[PDB]
Amino acid sequence: VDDEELNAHLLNEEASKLKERIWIGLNADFLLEQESKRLKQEADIATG
Amino acid sequence: LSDNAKTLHSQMMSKGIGALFTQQELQKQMGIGSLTDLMSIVQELLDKNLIKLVKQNDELKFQGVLESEAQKKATMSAEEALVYSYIEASGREGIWSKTIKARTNLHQHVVLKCLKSLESQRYVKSVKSVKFPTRKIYMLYSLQPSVFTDGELDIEFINSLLTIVWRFISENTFPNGFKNFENGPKKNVFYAPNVKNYSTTQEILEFITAAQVANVELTPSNIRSLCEVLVYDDKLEKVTHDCYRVTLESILQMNQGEGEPEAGNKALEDEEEFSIFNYFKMFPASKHDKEVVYFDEW
């Protein structure tokens, strides 16, 4: 399927941490609520 | 809050063990009326509430926690911190659902949404009783009271501890292997049964101390007394203090396994009452008046 599409999926490492910066800056509260919900679970499943 | 420095004065007077003398000093420092007015304001700023007794006024209770915040867990309602303050002073065991229904004469689904909205931040950490009459649950912290060393111990290791203390008292108050066969049992028992004639007298707890599993098995000589009462009403006589006398059913159902094989010594007398072994009557064979006689559905 070499029709300039297989050689254009991913770009380099340079303009990728900027995308990671955008994602962590915007989609942050849901990830914090998910990690805090995991912390809430592994708090309240210790006792019975 | 930040009204004045009297919040810091309340912290300094509520640091240690306080009483009515602390409030005597707090009214003794400055002029009385402004102190009473500002102290009423500070008590209206989510602080300690007074106590009506024979004495004038007491604190509640000794600490300076000051954590209700009145507006911020997830939403804003002046009903939730009330219910949290109701379950702060529950006491030893906890509070009922019918008790919190009886006070404040509210609905039950507001109690359910209090349950959910306070379980969302871990203040409904309950302790479960052995029985559930009316759900005696929902205390603050730590699952403290437990009404439970032998009560909540059901069921398998009660039987295991029962079997091993039965084995230990059977090997202490009687010798070890002289219950298997009748070839001179126990040798004129305990060597002409005089003044040797001993028993445990706290030695049973020493044998428990020799081996545990460290979950609930630190018994302060009271669960041992409960199992003592559990054993002298079935198969032990226990003349007055601590002399157990395990016998009169230990030998039969202890040496039935690999000690009492077939081709014995002599045939038994008819209707030995102290015997549970070899009682069968039918492959199917229940035609006529065999042993089908007992109680016959009166």
Is the separation of the CB atoms in B10 and B25 below 8 Å? no
B130: contact with A, CB 8 A cutoff = no
SS3 B243: strand
CB contact under 8 A, A44 and B125: yes
> Using CB atoms, which residue from B122, B128, B143 is nearest to A43?
B122
Is the separation of the CB atoms in B22 and B57 below 8 Å? no
Which residue in chain A is spatially nearest to B127 when comparing CA positions? A48
In degrees, to the nearest 5, what angle opens at C-alpha B191 toward C-alphas B185 and B195? 135
Is the separation of the CB atoms in B47 and B34 below 8 Å? no
B63-89 in b/e burial notation, b at 16+ Cβ within 10 A?
Answer: eeeeeeeeeeeeeeeeebbebbeebee
Residue B63 in tokens: 């600490």
Is the separation of the CB atoms in B147 and B129 below 8 Å? yes
Class of domain B79-137: mainly alpha
CB contact under 8 A, A40 and B125: no
CB contact under 8 A, B143 and A47: yes
Q: How far is CA B217 from the centre of its chain?
A: 13
Residue A31 in tokens: 């990830």
Which regions of B154-194 does DSSP assign to beta strands (E)?
none
Q: Which residue has the tokens 């810091």?
A: B8
Amino acid at A47: T
CB contact under 8 A, A47 and B122: no
CB contact under 8 A, A43 and B125: no
Is the separation of the CB atoms in B202 and B221 below 8 Å? yes
For B13, B34, B62, the CA distances from B22, given in Å and listed in that order, are: 7, 17, 11
Min Cα distance B208 → chain A (Å) is 28
Nearby residues of B17 by Cβ (< 8 Å), 6 or more positions away: B62
For B267, B285, B296, B298, the CA distances from B291, given in Å and listed in that order, are: 21, 11, 11, 16
Min Cα distance B22 → chain A (Å) is 39
Rounded to a whole number of angstroms, the distance between the first and last alpha carbons of chain B is 79
SS3 A18: helix
Distance CA(B65)–CA(B252), nearest Å, equals 65
Contacts B122 to A, Cβ<8 Å? 40, 43-44
Which residue in chain A is spatially nearest to B120 when comparing CA positions? A40
CB contact under 8 A, A40 and B122: yes
Min Cα distance A29 → chain B (Å) is 15
What are the beta bridge partners of residue B95?
A: B137
Amino acid at B298: W
Is the separation of the CB atoms in B145 and B127 below 8 Å? yes
> Resolution of the experimental model in angstroms, please?
4.0
DSSP label at B239? Answer: B
C-alpha count within 13 angstroms, C-beta hemisphere, residue B218: 2
In total, the C-beta contacts within 8 angstroms joining chain A to chain B are: 7
